[PDB]
Symmetry: D2
Amino acid sequence: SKGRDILTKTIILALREVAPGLEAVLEAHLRATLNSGIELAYDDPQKFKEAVSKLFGEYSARLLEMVIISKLKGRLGEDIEANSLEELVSEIRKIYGE
Amino acid sequence: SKGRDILTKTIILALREVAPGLEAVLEAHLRATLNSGIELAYDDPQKFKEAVSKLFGEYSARLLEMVIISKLKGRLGEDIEANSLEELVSEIRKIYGE
Amino acid sequence: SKGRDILTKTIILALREVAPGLEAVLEAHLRATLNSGIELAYDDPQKFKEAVSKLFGEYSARLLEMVIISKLKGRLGEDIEANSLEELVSEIRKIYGE
Amino acid sequence: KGRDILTKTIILALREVAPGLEAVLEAHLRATLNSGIELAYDDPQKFKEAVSKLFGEYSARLLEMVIISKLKGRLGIEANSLEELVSEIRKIYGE
Ligand SMILES: [Zn+2]
Ligand SMILES: [Zn+2]
Ligand SMILES: [Zn+2]
Ligand SMILES: [Zn+2]
C-alpha cells in the first residue's frame, strides 16, 4: 500500500543517513531473527521496535524511533503528533485511508 | 557560557526524553572513562562523540548526534545548518560570540 | 548466601576485566531501571539478563552470559552444564544446597 | 593455516552467541571496510576497532574475551588480547 511504501522507504533513507551500513546491519538482524524486512515497521510496529531493541539495546532503539518519527514529520509534514512508532503508523494509515 | 549552558541542558533533556536511565548511564560512562560530564559535548565535541561511540557503538552515537542537532535547532533556530556535533558547537559559539 | 556471594563476585570481577567503566555503567542502568544491583543476577537471573539486553542488546547480553558461565565453571566445577544464567544459578543452588 | 584457523574459530564463536550474529557482523565489516572476518588475523587492531563501532567497546571487549577463550579451547596458550592471539598463532605455524 502507499502508506506502507512511504514509511518503509523513509525509514531506509533514515538508516542510510545514520551510516552507510545500517540498512544492511538491521536487515541482516531482521531476516535472521524474524525472517522479515524493514516493512515490519508498518506491519507490526511493536515487533519492529522489540527487534531493534534486541540488536542495539533499548536506548539505541528509542533513539531510532525518535529519528524515524522526526523524518516522517519532515516528509509528510502535516499534523504528525505521534510519540511512538505505533502512533506514527496509526497516523499514516489515517492520512492514506488504510 | 550561554552556549555551553544551552547545549548541555538541551542534551540532558534529550537523554531524559529517550529513557529514564540514559542520563545516569551515559554520565557513569563519561565519569569512569574521561572524568567528565555531559558538558564535554560543548568542551570537546569530538571526544564526546568518541565516548558515546565507545558506549553503544557508532550507529547509536550517530543517532544521538542527529537527535541532539534536531533538538538544538528547535531550541535556537529551526535551521542551524550543522550536520555534526562539531559544526553545531562551532555555530553556537558564532551565535553567542564565544 | 555462599552461592549468591560467589556469583556476584564472579560477575563483578568479569566486569572489571572487560573495562574500567563497565561496573559503573551496568550498575547505573540496573539502579535506574530496576532499583537493583548486580546481585539481581542471582536473585532473578531472567530479569538480570533482560536488563542487560535492554542496555546493550541481546548479542552483547549473550556474550556477557557466556563469559559469566565460563568464569564460574573455572571456579566451581569444570563439569557444570549450564547454558544460560538461569541454569547456572540453579546449579549453584544445588551445589551449595541453597 | 593460522589465518584459516582463527577465522573458522571466530565464526563458530559468533554462532554460539546467536543465529544472526555472523550475518550482522559480516554486513557491518563489508559495508565499512569491504572486509570479512579474516581481518581479525590480517589486522587484529583494526578488527577490534570495527567491532567496537558496531556495538561499543564493552561489547567488543566481551567478544574478544570469548574469542580468546574459544581459540585457546581448540588450540590448547598465552594470550589476553587479539593482537597477542594472532601473534601466537603465527609462531605455531611459522607465519
Ligand atoms: Zn534493503
Ligand atoms: Zn556558563
Ligand atoms: Zn550471603
Ligand atoms: Zn579472562
